[model samples]
Target chain A: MNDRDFMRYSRQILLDDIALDGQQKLLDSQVLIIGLGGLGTPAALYLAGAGVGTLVLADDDDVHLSNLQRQILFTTEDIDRPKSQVSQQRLTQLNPDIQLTALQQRLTGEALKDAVARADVVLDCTDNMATRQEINAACVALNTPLITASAVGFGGQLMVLTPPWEQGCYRCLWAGVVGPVVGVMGTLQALEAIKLLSGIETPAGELRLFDGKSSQWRSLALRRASGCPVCG
Target chain B: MNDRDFMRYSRQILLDDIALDGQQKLLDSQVLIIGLGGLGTPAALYLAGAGVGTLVLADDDDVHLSNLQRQILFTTEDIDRPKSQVSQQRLTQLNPDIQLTALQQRLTGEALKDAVARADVVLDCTDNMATRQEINAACVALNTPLITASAVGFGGQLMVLTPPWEQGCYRCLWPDNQEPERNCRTAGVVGPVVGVMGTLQALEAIKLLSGIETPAGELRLFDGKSSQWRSLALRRASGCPVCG
Candidate 1:
């Protein structure tokens, strides 16, 4: 890495696991972020701030007044703007070193396949069961590393998917509504991605649950669903 | 609360513990953040975003390229800008409803006391031991509630001090970086670890300001590598310098 790269990630480089080599690895990786709401906002910010080589962020929704409670990306002035466009503008300002593609519409079919195929790691950050499952299916098909997490009403759950994704998937976990829980999980998702891009081994096939009401995180082994719609 | 506040804090209001009353407590609160580095940056952002009424941010450093690794409040353009000033601007943009004061220098002597005294809660987000202990000294003397947290490497620790600070003060717990045994320890901090620590700090403050039951006995320590949390009861030091 050059002097500028050294200065930018110097603090992270201090980690025993992410020394110079790891920092360079992250700078050369591609990450796809689906949904720019609560879960996606912190993940996108940290990934961009961490200097990932390329990032594709997708969100079709416009900023709503309620989203401001936890969606750290938007402001009062940004109330009606498309999350994707505003996020693109904001992320570009955060780190100029990385390449970013903002998709103002949700991905589907070929679009989903292509995007997942290109990313070194895909983050399932969208809300609702439909979009969340769609993302899981795409990541499984491409053999891409997928880190999926969600939060609602102070409860959060996360899992890392490996392909053929037999162990478990985002379809394998529960979901949430609070910003603190969502923000906490989202921040950790970026950390997991950084570990993956930097050549570190991360736990896969386990479902982790964070009970924000009690401030506890617990994980359980998965028995991949049989006759499952996506991975069965 | 007005219609806009109810809308902005809709999710938090959904919490069984921090509903309408708790959220109003958050908006009615004044929190002091000391140290705008890894821990303080996120604490400030989350609190401001949560709509805390007033915040006094104190930090002597400028944004550095290295700090970007985890100091999420700053951008490349903010590199040489004072942390206090930059964070104030960024936080204002995030939530303009709150009041903010930025101190461009390390808060010391009478200044530290004044800041701590005026706050509903004081958050100790500093890195070094000297500044941390001094902040503790002021908090203990003033009878203000303080939330002290630390993140290094993969480990994190958080504890809340409610004065007369009979429960072990920060000074009672550890003399310095070398060792002063307890449930908490320090190491190199990953970006996410600090994010968790700082965000948790904000949560504790909100809970306190809202008149939620005090979290007095438990001292929480996190092991990031294993994603485990350990909570232990705190005891007053027999001969703690300030508290004893």
Candidate 2:
């Protein structure tokens, strides 16, 4: 690599484990971040600054004033702009050398499959359980490493779902139709994405729950359901 | 009081442990967050959004381009701006009704004591161990609830220093001048600035401020490398340098 590349990531490369070679790998890798809200905003920014060569940000929402707090990618001027478009523009400015591709639409069905096929790593920063399960299914089908996180109110939870021979997905942890507690659990999803990208070793099929109320975090090893549709 | 206030946080207020009275208590609470970097960024955001009435963001650093990765409170344009200012402005905009204060300076000696004294809860989101220990000493001295979190590489750890009468400060578990590597073994801290540990800090602060029933989120430790979590529920270290 050139001097410019080394200088860009000189700080991280200073670390012994993530020396020149790891920084090189980071630059050569492509990552896809879904959901441009709370969790996705931070996760996407970190991955981009880490010098990940290409980033695909997928989200369907506009930059509302409410998102300003946790979603630091946009500004008051970006209020009406699509989250993906603004994220792309801002992230590109953060690291002009890296390539940023914005998909200003929701990921579902064919789109989900297409995005998963294109990425070396997939970070699920979505809020809803259904979307998380769908992303898990797609990742398991493609055998891609998926990092998932969720945060709501004060509590947040995260899990890394790398299927053991396609045995379980996120749904295996909470199989039934859970209530409308999406945003409350979407924050931890960002944490999981960061860990997965950082090369941390985590159990394949366990769900980690962080209760902000009690300030305690717990993990449950998931067993594949016999009658489940996705992983059975 | 009208039913609307009660209905607003009904789900949380409904918890028999934290009834409607607890929700009101939260609205009147003030929390002090030290260090607006990785952990503080997320912790402050969540607490503000959760309806904590007042939030004090303390940090001495301006928004450097490198901090954008983990410090979610800043933006590309916010570069060179103090983190405390950016966080205060953005957080207040997120919840206009909440009272937000920005202290764009580092906490040391008497400054730390004054800030800790005025708050119901204190969160130590500093990266360095020396600051963590110093903040813990202040909290212990003032009898304020202390929540501390650190993230390096992919692994992160959190500890809650309750009233010293109940549990010991951080140095109690690992002595002062103890090598940093023993606690934060992993080299790189990544992912959500409010990782599992940061989230725990936010929760502990909320519980302490709201006078909600405490459930020992205290001293619960998380190792993101193995995704393993353990809890010590420690007591005052008899030979502790800070708080015995």
Candidate 3:
């Protein structure tokens, strides 16, 4: 590795597990972030700062005034710009050495499938149930490790969905379970993305719920839906 | 009661528990953030976004290059600047209407005592054990709700240190616990900072401030090892160091 690279990440590289070797892995890894909102803002920022060499950020929405509250990636001037474009520009300036790919269009069908296939890790930061289900389907098809997160009001939930590529995919937990309550918040999405990128060990096929109301975090083991479609 | 404010915060204000009145409470509330690092960054940001009118951010450390990873409040240009200043400037831009105070000094002894006394709620985001103990002592003394969070490497720990008014505090857990090994970098503090632990702190603080419910979130332990959380219901220690 170059001296500059080592110096840039010397603090983290100083750790035993993430020493020089781990830093190398981080520097060479590729993380695809879907959603540049609250969770994606911090998630993408942390990953970029941690020396993740390549990042693919996809978001179809334009920046809005309301998003400025928690979406730190955008600025007042970026109110009408596509989130992906602004995020890519911000991250590039944060770390010029890293390669960032900004896709300002919606991911659907073939485009979604191809994105997941090329990513080492995929973070689902999209809001709404339909988008989450679509993202999960794409990950299941690609057999890529997926980190899913949702937040609404003051509560948030995060989970690591490692498909039966060894065990099962996200659908394994709630097969064919479609709902309108699939909450999406930026902070939870950031947490899921961070866990996946940092190689933290979490039980696969389980949902971790964080209730801000009581500040309680509970995890429930989810079994594959026997009769459901998707990963069933 | 302006249309702009209502339209902007419509989703949050619509919740029965929060409604327009609770949102007003949020707008009128004051929160004291004791650190501007990983956890504090998100907590401060969210609180500002949620419209907490006044925020007092206290920290003595300057923004080092290493902080860039998880200290989302600061940017590359903020290196060498005190964290308090960086956080204050960034938060102001994030929500121009909210009021902010940046204390560029460490909280020790009397200074900490006074800080906790003046705030409606206290958020403990400091890393060192000594500071944690000091802050907890101040919260217990002032009867302020303390939201404590710790993130080292991949592991993160959170506890709402609400000493039973006239009873025990966090010091009661381990009477003479020494500080843990400090591995800010190699252990990887980035992920845990913004993801799991920091977000949790923001959630808990909002809950406490809103008075919607006194959450039974429990003073628990999180082992990032298996990504499992072990809950430990905390109570007053009869022979506690701080309260006994």
Candidate 4:
């Protein structure tokens, strides 16, 4: 890291976890962020702000009036615009050093597989289970690490899927669910992802459920299903 | 709430804890945030983005080179700018509906009192024990609810001061003995550690403004070693100097 890079991330570099070498690893890495909603916003901001060299965002939805409640990345002036494009603009302004690719549409199949293949890590911030499962399949196929987060009503769930993964995929979990506690989990995903990219070691296959209402965090170990298909 | 507002805050309104009336309360309330460092930045952003009607930010530091690690509010361009003014400009851009006041210089005495008196709640995100004590004394004198937080290394501490009449004051807790441990300066802190505390501060303010029935006298302890959270109930110190 150069003097300017060091100054930009001096405090983080002071950490034993993310020293100069780790920050460089992050700068040399690429991340795929799917879904530009509540979960995606903070994760993307923190990720970019932390100097992840490249990031690709996927989401087809437009910024609606209701998103202001939890999606802090989008302002009132951003209403009616594509979430992918809007978030890209905001995050870039936050950190101009990083490179961003905005897939301003719901990514699927070959496109999803290709993006997941390029990233050092993939964060699943989408809401629909079908899309999440599809993302899981791509990551598992590419042997890429995937971090998924879901929040609703002041609580949320988080899970990490590592390649050749034994615990389970999103398919092995619940069908579809969203949490009201988006920012917290989103932020956690950012933390865990940075930890992973910086070589700080994270739980491989555990389900972390956080209840923001009570300010509590809980995680459960998992067992792989026989016919889990993706992870199996 | 009108249609536009309801749509803007639909997710919060969906919660039973903060339905229609609670959302309205947040919109009508004013919050005073002191300090623009790690803890204050996230707390201020979430509070402002979550729709706090009016916010007053009191900070007196210029953005330093070392702050970018945890104080996520500023960029490289903001290195030499004043923290209070920069944060106000950034946050107002985040949420234009709220009224924002920035104290660009150090605030003490009547200036601090006047600022604390107008808000329904005050968030203490300063770094020093002296400043924390000072802010606590002011809140106690004015009977304002205070959400104070301190973070160092990988863990943090958070406490909610109800009023002059209840619970314990900062003076009662230590009787003026500073924590034997050091601050984040040399100990090193993870960005997310302070992020969680700051976000929690915002939530506590939201709950207080919402008039929720949840109790507010817990001295929470957090250890990043295991990512576990625990709390001990706080009581009013009978011999407390501040309250007495």
**Which candidate ranks first by DockQ, i.e. highest?**
1
TM-score (all chains, Cα) for each model: 0.93, 0.80, 0.88, 0.92
Q: What is the C-alpha lDDT of each candidate?
A: 0.81, 0.69, 0.71, 0.79
Q: Model 2, residue A6: displacement in angstroms?
A: 4.1
The candidate scoring highest on lDDT is 1
lDDT of 2 at B87: 91
Residue-level lDDT of model 1, residues A43-127, one tens digit each, is 8988887778899998888998778777877777899889999999888877877899998887888888989998899998986
Error of 3 at A163 (Å): 4.9
Residue pairs that clash (backbone atoms under 3 angstroms), model 3: A15-B186, A38-A186, A39-A186, A151-A185, A163-A168, A164-A167, A164-A168, A214-B215
Q: Score candidate 1 by TM-score against the native.
A: 0.93
Better of 1 and 4 by DockQ: 1
- Candidate 3, A98-118: lDDT as tens digits: 889998877888898899999
lDDT of 1 by residue, B1-244 (tens): 8998888888788778788887888888899999998889878887887888999999999998878878888887898999999999988877888899899988889989989999989999987677788888899888888898888777788988887676778877766744344223332457887888887887677767877664664689986665667888888778888877
Docking band of candidate 1: medium
State the lDDT of candidate 2 residue by residue for A59-134, as single tens digits. Answer: 9989765455446456557878899998998888767788899999989998999999888778898878889888
Rank list by TM-score: 1, 4, 3, 2
Model 4 chain A poorest ten-residue lDDT run = A172-181
Error of 3 at A213 (Å): 1.9
